[PDB]
Amino acid sequence: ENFQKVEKIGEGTYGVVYKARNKLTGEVVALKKIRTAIREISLLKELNHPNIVKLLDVIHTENKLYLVFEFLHQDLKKFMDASALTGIPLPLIKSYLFQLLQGLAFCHSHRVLHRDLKPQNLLINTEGAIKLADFGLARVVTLWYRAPEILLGCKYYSTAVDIWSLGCIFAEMVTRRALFPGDSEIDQLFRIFRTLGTPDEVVWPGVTSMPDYKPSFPKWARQDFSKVVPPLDEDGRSLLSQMLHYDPNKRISAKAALAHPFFQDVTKPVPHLR
Ligand SMILES: CO[C@@]1(C)[C@H](O)C(=O)C(C)=C2OC(=O)c3c(C)cc(O)c(C)c3O[C@@H]21
Numbered sequence: 001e002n003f004q005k006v007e008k009i010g011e012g013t014y015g016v017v018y019k020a021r022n023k024l025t026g027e028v029v030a031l032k033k034i035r036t037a038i039r040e041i042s043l044l045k046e047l048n049h050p051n052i053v054k055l056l057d058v059i060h061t062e063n064k065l066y067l068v069f070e071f072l073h074q075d076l077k078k079f080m081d082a083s084a085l086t087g088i089p090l091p092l093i094k095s096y097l098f099q100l101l102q103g104l105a106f107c108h109s110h111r112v113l114h115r116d117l118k119p120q121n122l123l124i125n126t127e128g129a130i131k132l133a134d135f136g137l138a139r140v141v142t143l144w145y146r147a148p149e150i151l152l153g154c155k156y157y158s159t160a161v162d163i164w165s166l167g168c169i170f171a172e173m174v175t176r177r178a179l180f181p182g183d184s185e186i187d188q189l190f191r192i193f194r195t196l197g198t199p200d201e202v203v204w205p206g207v208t209s210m211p212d213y214k215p216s217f218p219k220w221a222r223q224d225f226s227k228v229v230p231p232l233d234e235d236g237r238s239l240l241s242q243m244l245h246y247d248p249n250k251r252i253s254a255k256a257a258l259a260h261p262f263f264q265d266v267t268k269p270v271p272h273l274r
Contacts, residue, residue, distance in 0.1 A: 003031055003066075013141070019071065029056060032067040037139070041067070044136045047110065051103030053123060053133040072123035072131065074273050076169070079124055082274070084176055091269050093173045096122075096130045098258065098266050100166055103132045105254035108159040112136040115157065117165040118145045119172065128270040143188040144168065144178050148199070149248055151189045153211030160248035163257070167243030174232050190218070196244060197222035204246040235262035 006019040006028075015034035022029055030053075044055045054070035076096070080088070100122065107114070114135050121133040143151070147164040150157065171179040180195070182188025193199070198219045199207045207213060225237045232240070239262045242252035252260075 003029075003068075005031070015065075020068075022068075028071050030069040030071045032069070034065040034067070038065065040139055041137060044112070047107070047112065047136070049103060049106040050129065051099050051131055052106065052135060053131045067137075069133070070131075072125055072133075074124050075120055075133075076122035076124060076130065076173075077119040079271065079273070080119060080173065080176070087176055088173050089269065090174075091267050092128070092271060093170075094263065094266050095128060095268050096124075096173070097166070097170050098263050099130045100132065100169075101254045101257050103135075104159070104162050104166065105258065107132070107135055108162070108254055113157060113159060114138075114162045114165070115150075116141070116145075117162050117169075118142065119169055122169070124271065124273065126270065126273060128268050143182050143185060144180055146188060147248070148189065148192055148246060149210070151185055151192075152207070152213050155211075158248055159253070160251040163243050163251050163254060167240055170236075170240060170243065171229050174229050174236070179228070190220075193217070193220045195223050195228055196246065199246040207246070233262075235260070235264075238262070 002023040004021040004023060006021060008016060009019050009030065010017045012032060015032050018031045018033065020029050020031035021027070038058065038060050042058045045058065048054065053072070055067060056070065057066070057068040059066040059068070104114075112135065114132065115138045116134065117132070123131045123133050125131075145165040145168045147157075147161040150161060168179045180188060180191040182191045197203075198217055201208055208215070225241055229237060229240055239252075239257060239260045242260075243257065245251040
């Protein structure tokens with residue numbers, strides 16, 4: 001093959017990922033080797049936006065599926081773990097969040113959903129830019145970033161499932177701690193309820209008719225938000241609480257969130273990566 005596999009960079013759910021070199025172009029790429037979908041996947045090649053990792057080639061040869069992506073060196077999770085002692089500067093936080101929303105706003109306007117948006121698959125660079133990886137393919141794994149409508153067994157997700165995840169990552173960058181670090185579907189769901197209170201028909205019309213909603217859930221009270229994400233300012237908390245509305249239809253759109261006053265003073269600073 002016209003691909004020379006430098007080294008393995010991770011295992012996925014259907015295939016493995018390699019850093020590779022395209023023998024034609026001398027082009028360094030992320031290469032996913034997996035063992036109707038091919039047609040549905042191929043469409044993501046058309047998505048071109050500065051905050052989407054580019055899907056370069058979908059190869060279906062030797063009855064096998066290779067996906068080739070734009071390569072980047074570091075993911076947000078490594079950059080969070082590295083920036084643990086000092087914490088990410090708020091201007092860099094604000095930049096990444098504004099950028100990720102422009103990506104979601106782009107994906108959503110083309111009817112494209114991530115579903116499993118988490119820090120591991122947010123890639124960064126020396127220009128101080130952040131890109132969405134593994135976007136629109138999905139169509140033990142951590143549940144830390146799973147929307148409450150998924151955990152309650154809704155089959156028919158909307159774009160609001162990704163706004164939730166971004167809100168969780170925003171909190172994590174600010175606090176240096178997963179917001180809802182759950183270790184089972186019930187544990188995850190109960191961690192959200194311990195912070196935002198158990199939902200009801202008042203705040204979430206339909207919630208009692210969800211597939212996996214029990215009337216036998218405990219009734220927890222909502223926690224004040226200055227205790228959850230300090231010392232984030234009132235704009236940040238305001239934007240976070242609109243991103244974490246229980247009711248997906250009340251949950252703020254990526255487009256609407258770009259016009260939030262939190263981004264009035266937004267800049268593009270440049271990180272120190274190793
Ligand atoms: C550091 O990046 C990793 C290895 C990341 O630790 C990780 O968790 C997985 C599973 C990856 O998977 C990827 O598929 C991936 C894609 C689509 C593009 C890309 O440029 C890169 C570099 C990719 O590697 C990432």
